Design a protein around this ligand. Structure first.
Ligand SMILES: Nc1ncnc2c1ncn2[C@@H]1O[C@H](CSCC[C@H](N)C(=O)O)[C@@H](O)[C@H]1O
Ligand SMILES: Nc1ncnc2c1ncn2[C@@H]1O[C@H](CSCC[C@H](N)C(=O)O)[C@@H](O)[C@H]1O
Lengths: 183, 284, 284, 188
DNA sequence: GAATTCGGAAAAATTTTTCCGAATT
DNA sequence: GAATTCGGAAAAATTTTTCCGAATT
């Protein structure tokens, strides 16, 4: 839990987003400002050769975001790869214990992870996921962002069988209590 | 201040080589928590070490709270299963599937048990795996542990080939490997009475029986009473550098004992790597 | 006046209990000629005794000249196969057929090795067999060896029932059997670490694995970690009084080692019988 | 089994023989080794040796010949065929002269085809010699082990054995006994 | 009394061999 | 460039379990 910041102290969030780019989705809610072409968002897609010194130089960061490739895109990478790699660089980006400041991370799955993959995710990201539906598509989200209903897995099971920024956006809005509100 | 016993978290412990090597070096062991799933392996560590090892079963059920309560730890060691990474298996599933993905459990728990930045206390760790593995896997493991490995082949201190990679932060891991006086460096040194070794060094021993017969045309290593023979389990124990009968446990036969020994560490190699720890923890 | 090492002919030698008991008593063994046909038994005696035993294979090919050449002998011992004599085998072929008739080979060679009248030199011999045998067979064996047997049950000095007949001329064979200090008299004494004995004495151990499970309803003898279990081979070795790992030879597993041990002698019973020999031969 | 010098005719004595399983009493007189006047007969015949001790053989006085034989082929045997072998060997050693007093002493064992071939090598291992196969021509045969200084292929006897199953032929035995004439009295 | 025992032929399990196989050394 | 290797699914051996069984304590 983080205390909330009075409105005059809030600052523009610095976000590192992996695999996906949420740049102009996150500006749509006012977290970034259009004009910073060297914006406060850093986008990388092939993390496999990135060192801690790389993340530290692009830092500091206040939000770290990663997501599985979209369900359908037949990936060139094992679905857990996006998890373990997200985990690796998130630990490079955390604030030091000596300087605690608001700092949040998000990971979202497109139903591209099977259930043994899911138990790894919830063990490494230290929490069960939240299942956010669309009524047909759905995503799973792990994050420490404080958030604001019921579905069983057989719908998703059969949906996944058969073969999405809308659902990921809303949860981004408790972050307004911490950073500047542009637009 | 003063020397204290070493506290060890050991993942994928196998037949407790970590404990045996520390004991053989004379280091007081205060706590040795071992994560291990094979029931015959657990019997070996249990019986051969008189209940001093605290077993905790599947690595994937050790929690963040477990590391805190069972700790603090001074040494975190592990060698994960190489059956989905080694070149031997055509059905290898890589680093991210099957058992390969068990490495990240070590990466994960290493980070839980590492002291924080305010703590300058000594903390040592080591991770072992095979050389016969894809370059991308060797790269990614060095990405997560954040360092490059040493290659040590047991052939420098034992009678067998065994090239392994060792990642970690122990003192002097890059130093030269020189054999000791008691090292059984040739197969003849390992064999029982009235047996003849055909070769001085044997090919890498795996869990299968094919690794014992040598070369491209599968020749028997030993001659006894005129006839050819394979190696005995006491002889395998000596090649690996374990005490003889170390695996004479739990009614196991030839195949079971070779499986435990086939996947273990070379004791003399591990002794070389752990030896710099004598000056950081209490001795006997 | 002064004693020399003992010279031993041992027929149906098995795993060389005779030699081991002599070595354990401190008797210098000058010659130990063993007749034995099982390749794994010979491997045990060879290995565990560093080539001191002179093996000569099938008892029925030892000639009158062999006994002269290999001799003289001071001690002639044997326990012939009791698989065609014991009550366990309904297909028993008796004393005169099958393997029963191997007894007469011992009778035959005993008389070849006996000194002649006028030779007052010490000559000792012993023959062992089961009690579970027809009275006519027990009578005829005592007809050929010209004397009646003593019956010693190992249960007085070991953790197992084991009643056997001993014919012979050693000193004090009819004396009382009193247990010694180091005798493991209860099953718990034999077991490995972290194992619990349900009973204090186990039923006669045979070459089959059913003999390990106790009684009429076939109960497991041991509890380990809450679950029931059978005996391990080190534990069988201890019940018989062999050194642990005595049969950890030749890649043998559970079944093979139990067969060698199941048909062998109880070492403590044998020591008691041979102990009066210290005063006739050289000591260490 | 020993080699013996022969005895001048005036020194020969009536043989004392121990005969087991089969009695050669009334056959051995036909060659003049026994006489019909003796109270003891100089021949001792016993047929159930299983409870015979050494001192029984010693008390029955000294012996110069020891004979035993398998029962006749046509005899449903109540005894394992090797039993007659081992038992004969058992009492023969009770009867031998001591090494301190060497005198002429002979033994005979003969088989009625009642021993099969694994029993045959037990016989020749224990009696320290191969047997001699003595045939009957118009069909029967016996094999003899003996230390007395006295051609058919085995499938002749093999097939002879198997049909015959459906008494003891002394005719074959007797003649072997002759040479002993050179050692003992020759009663008319 | 009914409990015991130096086993064995079948039968049902575990087990130890043929080929297998390719990237890394 | 020919050899090497902390393995595995089938297949062929080997092995470990069911009933077996009775005279002797
Ligand atoms: N999920 C898991 N949790 C804990 N141990 C596991 C595991 N999966 C496999 N293992 C164990 O990991 C070990 C890999 S082999 C390691 C052997 C060890 N280096 C030694 O010296 O003996 C095997 O013992 C295997 O049984
Ligand atoms: N013909 C023969 N010649 C020599 N030994 C034989 C034989 N037939 C069987 N044997 C052996 O006789 C032994 C009978 S069991 C004897 C066990 C021995 N007294 C001990 O202490 O171990 C077995 O080892 C068997 O292999």
């Amino acid at each position: 839990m983080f205390e909330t910041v009075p409105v005059w102290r809030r600052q523009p969030v610095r976000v590192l987003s992996l695999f996906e780019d949420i740049k102009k989705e996150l500006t749509s809610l006012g977290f970034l400002e259009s004009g910073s072409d060297p914006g406060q968002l850093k986008h990388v897609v092939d993390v496999t050769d990135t060192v801690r010194k790389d993340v530290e130089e692009w830092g500091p960061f206040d939000l770290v975001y990663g997501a599985t490739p979209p369900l359908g895109h037949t990936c060139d990478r094992p679905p857990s790869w996006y998890l373990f790699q997200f985990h690796r660089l998130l630990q490079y980006a955390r604030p030091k214990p000596g300087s605690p400041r608001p700092f949040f991370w998000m990971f979202v799955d497109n139903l591209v992870l099977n259930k043994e993959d899911l138990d790894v995710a919830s063990r490494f990201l230290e929490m069960e996921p939240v299942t956010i539906p669309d009524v047909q598509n759905a995503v799973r989200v792990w994050s420490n962002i404080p958030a604001i209903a019921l579905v069983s897995e057989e719908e998703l099971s059969l949906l996944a069988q058969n073969k999405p920024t809308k659902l990921v956006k809303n949860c981004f809005l408790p972050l307004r209590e911490y950073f500047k509100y542009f637009s | 201040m003063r020397r204290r016993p070493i506290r060890v978290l050991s993942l994928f412990d196998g037949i407790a080589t970590g404990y045996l090597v520390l004991k053989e070096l004379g280091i007081k062991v205060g706590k040795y928590v071992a994560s291990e799933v094979c029931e015959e392996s657990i019997a070996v560590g249990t019986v051969k070490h008189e209940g001093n090892i605290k077993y905790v079963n599947d690595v994937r059920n050790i929690t963040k709270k477990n590391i805190e309560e069972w700790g603090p730890f001074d040494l975190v060691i592990g060698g994960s299963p190489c059956n989905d990474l080694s070149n031997v298996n055509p059905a290898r599933k890589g680093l991210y599937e099957g058992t390969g993905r068990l490495f990240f459990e070590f990466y994960h728990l290493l980070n839980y048990s590492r002291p924080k930045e305010g703590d300058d206390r000594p903390f040592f760790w080591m991770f072992e795996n095979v050389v016969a593995m894809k370059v991308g896997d060797k790269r990614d493991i060095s990405r997560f542990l954040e360092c490059n490995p040493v290659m040590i082949d047991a052939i420098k201190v034992s009678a067998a080939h065994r090239a392994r990679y060792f990642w970690g932060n122990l003192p002097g891991m890059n130093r030269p490997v020189i054999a000791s006086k008691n090292d059984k460096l040739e197969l003849q040194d390992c064999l029982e009475y009235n047996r003849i070794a055909k070769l001085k060094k044997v090919q890498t021993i795996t869990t299968k029986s094919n690794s014992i017969k040598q070369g491209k045309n599968q020749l028997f290593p030993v001659v006894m009473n005129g006839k050819e023979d394979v190696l005995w389990c006491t002889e395998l124990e000596r090649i690996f550098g374990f005490p003889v009968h170390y695996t004479d446990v739990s009614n196991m036969g030839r195949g079971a004992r070779q499986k435990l020994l086939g996947r273990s560490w070379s004791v003399p190699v591990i002794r070389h790597l752990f030896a710099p720890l004598k000056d950081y923890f209490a001795c006997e």
